[PDB]
């Protein structure tokens, strides 16, 4: 291949970091540890993939260049560029089966694999399209991401539901014990559509949203999603399966309403967790007039007890929770006051910011 380009170090670094995202340690196939480099019509394209998703970055070439393509080891190429001095000019060209990198009197010769062998996601058609601020997408993901399953056999839970309805984009994540849902208006009327983005794709999409001026352009096909932000293009396959319906998970008629400060509640739960069972993480909540008592016991016979003033009137009740589930919600809310809606000791509780209904959290108790 004839491929040649010269580019400033600082135009390469963030592109290289981004496209190396899909790459896991110990790739199954050697070429999956490589980046595809393509020079065409004044643009350098860099692609990384894991066969389920891909990340593409486009870099403008103003200095002399020659078209062509190759694939090089991602981590080694990134480490070389990062290790060069600030402001370095990076001259790249092909020599047989090697890619040569020169800056000053630093020279590197990397092994390559043919660009013709690099895997590509199958062609597909967009059927839903919309743009939204990056901050809006970031908020939608951070508000729910923690509730996704990790490696459940129910593969559709190891991902995030992305749903369009009316003017809003909604994210839903659940692991069967706890659920998180968040809706945000995007100011454009949309068709009703729902897709499941794999966990790993959710993390990638999250990582491409910086503190930037660019909008996020989203395209959804029957089996793929694409997100375009500036000079970055992320594509992922979608997860098959029926995602649970959050509307059916929300507690139907919660007759008990507690309100309390978010940080006061968080710090009390965080201290009580110290003396909770390391495996089961159970804490007990005792609600009585304008008071919440949190207790935690462990197999060493130790006990933590926190008493808080809260706003509550109604029947005294005792309910048990996995304290990590509660702390996850309080950390995600990061608001002033929290509202908890309860029914009884065997039913779920709904937690939300007392001042906003944009996000809702449902946590199932442990038997008391």
């Amino acid at each position: 291949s004839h491929m040649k380009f010269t580019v400033e170090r600082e135009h390469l670094l963030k592109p290289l970091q981004q496209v190396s995202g899909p790459l896991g340690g110990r790739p199954t196939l050697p070429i999956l540890g490589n980046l595809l480099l393509q020079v065409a019509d004044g643009t350098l394209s860099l692609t990384g993939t894991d066969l389920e998703m891909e990340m593409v970055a486009r870099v403008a070439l103003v200095q002399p260049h020659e078209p062509g393509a190759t694939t090089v080891p991602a981590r080694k190429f990134f480490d070389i560029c990062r290790g060069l001095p600030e402001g370095a000019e990076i001259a790249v060209q092909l020599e047989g089966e090697r890619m040569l990198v020169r800056s000053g009197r630093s020279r590197f010769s990397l092994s390559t694999l043919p660009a013709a062998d690099f895997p590509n996601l199958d062609d597909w058609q967009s059927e839903v399209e919309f743009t939204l601020p990056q901050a809006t997408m970031k908020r939608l993901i951070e508000a729910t991401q923690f509730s996704m399953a990790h490696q459940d056999v129910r593969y559709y839970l190891n991902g995030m539901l992305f749903e369009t309805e009316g003017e809003e984009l909604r994210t839903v994540a659940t692991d069967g014990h706890r659920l998180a849902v968040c809706s945000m208006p995007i100011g454009q009327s949309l068709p009703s559509h729902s897709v499941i983005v794999p966990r790993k794709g959710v993390i990638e999409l999250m990582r491409m949203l910086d503190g930037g001026d660019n909008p996020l352009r989203v395209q959804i096909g029957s089996n793929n999603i694409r997100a375009h932000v500036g000079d970055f293009i992320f594509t992922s396959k979608l997860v098959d399966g029926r995602f649970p319906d959050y509307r059916r998970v929300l507690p139907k008629n919660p007759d008990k309403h507690l309100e309390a400060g978010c940080d006061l509640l968080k710090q009390a739960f965080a201290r009580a967790a110290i003396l909770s069972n390391e495996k089961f993480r159970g804490v007990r909540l005792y609600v009585s007039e304008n008071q919440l008592k949190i207790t935690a016991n462990n197999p060493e016979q130790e006990e933590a007890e926190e008493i808080l003033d809260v706003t509550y009137s109604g029947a005294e009740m005792e309910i048990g929770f996995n304290v990590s589930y509660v702390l996850d919600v309080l950390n995600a809310l990061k608001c002033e006051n929290v509202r908890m809606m309860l029914t009884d000791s065997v039913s779920s509780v709904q937690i939300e910011d007392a001042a906003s209904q944009s996000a809702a959290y449902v946590v199932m108790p442990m038997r008391l």
Binding site: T174, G176, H177, R178, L179, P244, R248, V249, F280, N322, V346, S348, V362, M364, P365, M366, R367
Partner: peptide
């Protein structure tokens, strides 16, 4: 631990 669904 109880289940949501």
């Amino acid at each position: 631990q109880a289940d949501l669904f």
